[PDB]
């Protein structure tokens, strides 16, 4: 026919509003980031973080570490015509600064301010130095000045009809079950785009996902699929995946709970430590993702990928409370003191009140939901009484921004080295800020913690961040913080019927997933090609 629709998945939803705000990612598309506004450099964290220059074309930090100067490419224009400019990234930081809420990544804890030095270079002061910096600075979106300035309220506005920089701006059609969004008409690297528009239709969870995926309806998906080589893979010789190894997967227990009872369990280390060896994490492997991750046995999350940077002292001294051990969970709990006094059956806290753990997980992530289920019942083996929630994804969220959840089965996102899990999963500084993720919402604070996390890039060299890296990993397994329980996979599946070009285990060219967060979609997008 006329035109290539490419059938992507990054986002459940039961119903789409419009909305296409990149600094509300709890209520946002999530075809906003990247397809939208373009970043400034996009890393590709599989391979050492080497960088791909967008809408600038260069960097250099100070000397000091202290400042970080971007050059911005000449000759790019947003897509109702207007030039790009520096005055479009000065805009973007001061309004992250002025209306916090805006702050998704911690940004403001980093960057101090913003300076013009003409149209096409801009200056960035530090708070603290930090030789990561310009990875930190690529996460905030740029928007137009020439539009956001001039919008009563910019935390509310909804911006139904985008003007972006990236490759696909044109809202083309919108409905509640499907929308299509089509080429930028003034797109700045249209000679390496070959799709014309992206198609986005609505799957509220894994069941109805997996009807659409066996039926061949899909091009480009990152979602679980159960028993992946006899229900897709054997439906047609066109379906095809690629799992490359992911990030860590733990139970968070919320250190803020507001019952009493409560309290006193979650915050107690014998508490955690007991729950964690009555998980039997090879069990969760084999039934919950039908073998499709590796045992995580490290106290501090750190996981096997990252094998090379442990301290083997500290790995080795809390194994034992990471490995399944029923009999031992229950001798824990009676020499700690969670004794059952009421007669129930289960243990009651230290001072002898009952308490049941409501542990969530998100509406239709099925393989997660599976997970806590099993736990329950391991759980329930050795006496501590729990219940599954499976609330929908923004009302898990909310709960842990506001600290009113028990215990939640998460992911975390994965990078080249441990710092973007064990930043993102323990720095405080990430756990006030109505903008901020749910991965640091346990409230367990510890400016010691957050010294080494903050130090881990004052330089470049690597055998100086190896040491940080021992001090952070003891601290975190001494306090067993959260309970780890494995490393996962990138899930991802690709159709060679209406596209070619994907990267895949002979292609390994970057992580291959759709979702929002994986800023490397815009490079994986610009290598496909149309067959129909
Ligand atoms: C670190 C992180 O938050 N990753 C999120 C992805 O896990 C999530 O994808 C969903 O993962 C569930 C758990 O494995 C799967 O059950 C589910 O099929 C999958 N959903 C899709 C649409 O791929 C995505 C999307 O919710 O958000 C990422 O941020
Ligand atoms: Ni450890």
């Given at each position: 026919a006329e035109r290539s629709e490419l059938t992507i998945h990054p986002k459940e939803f039961t119903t789409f509003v419009r909305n296409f705000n990149p600094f509300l990612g709890a209520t946002?598309?999530?075809?906003?980031?990247?397809?939208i506004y373009e970043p400034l450099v996009v890393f590709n964290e599989m391979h050492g973080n080497t960088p791909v220059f967008r809408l600038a074309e260069n960097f250099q930090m100070s000397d000091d570490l202290m400042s970080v100067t971007f050059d911005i490419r000449k000759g790019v224009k947003w897509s109702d015509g207007e030039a790009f400019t520096a005055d479009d990234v000065v805009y973007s930081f001061n309004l992250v600064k002025e209306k916090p809420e805006l702050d998704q990544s911690g940004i403001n804890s980093w960057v101090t301010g913003v300076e013009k030095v003409n149209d096409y270079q801009v200056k960035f002061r530090l708070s603290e130095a930090n030789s990561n910096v310009p990875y930190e600075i690529a996460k905030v979106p740029v928007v137009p000045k020439h539009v956001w300035?001039?919008?009563?309220?910019p935390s509310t506005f909804t911006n139904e009809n985008p003007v972006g920089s990236g490759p696909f701006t044109v809202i083309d059609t919108f409905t509640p079950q499907l929308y299509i969004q089509c080429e930028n008409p003034n797109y700045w690297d249209a000679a390496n785009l070959d799709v014309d528009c992206l198609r986005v239709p609505q799957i509220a969870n894994n069941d109805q996902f997996l009807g659409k995926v066996v039926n061949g309806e899909m091009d480009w998906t990152s979602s679980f699929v159960p028993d992946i080589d006899r229900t897709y893979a054997a439906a047609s010789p066109k379906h095809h995946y690629w799992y490359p190894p992911a990030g860590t997967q733990a139970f968070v227990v919320n250190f803020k709970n507001p019952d009493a009872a409560k309290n006193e369990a979650l915050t107690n280390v014998d508490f955690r430590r007991a729950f964690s060896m009555a998980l039997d994490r090879q069990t969760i492997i084999d039934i919950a993702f039908y073998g499709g991750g590796t045992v995580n046995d490290f106290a501090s999350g750190l996981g096997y990928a990252f094998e090379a940077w442990s301290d083997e002292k500290t790995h080795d001294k809390f194994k034992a409370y990471n490995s399944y051990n029923a009999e031992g969970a229950k001798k824990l709990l009676a020499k700690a003191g969670f004794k059952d006094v009421n007669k129930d059956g289960f243990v009651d806290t230290p001072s002898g009140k009952s308490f049941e753990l409501l542990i969530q997980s998100p509406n239709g992530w099925t393989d997660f939901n599976n997970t806590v289920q099993l736990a329950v019942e391991q759980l329930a083996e050795v006496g501590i009484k729990a219940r599954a929630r499976t609330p929908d994804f923004s009302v898990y969220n909310q709960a842990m921004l506001e600290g009113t959840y028990d215990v939640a089965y998460t992911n975390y996102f994965h990078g080249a080295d441990p710092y973007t899990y064990w930043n993102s999963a323990y720095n405080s500084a990430l756990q006030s800020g109505d903008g901020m993720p749910r991965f640091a919402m346990h409230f367990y604070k510890n400016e010691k913690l957050d010294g080494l996390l903050n130090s881990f890039?004052?330089?470049?060299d690597k055998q100086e961040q190896l040491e940080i890296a021992h001090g952070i990993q003891q601290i975190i397994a001494q306090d067993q913080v959260t309970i780890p329980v494995l490393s996962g996979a990138y899930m991802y599946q690709y159709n060679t019927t209406r596209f070619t070009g994907w990267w895949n285990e002979?292609?390994?060219?970057?992580?291959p997933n759709i979702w929002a967060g994986i800023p490397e979609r815009l490079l994986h997008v610009l290598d496909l090609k149309p067959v129909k």
């Open positions: 946002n598309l999530h075809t906003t980031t990247d397809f300035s001039k919008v009563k309220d890039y004052k330089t470049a002979e292609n390994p060219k970057g992580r």
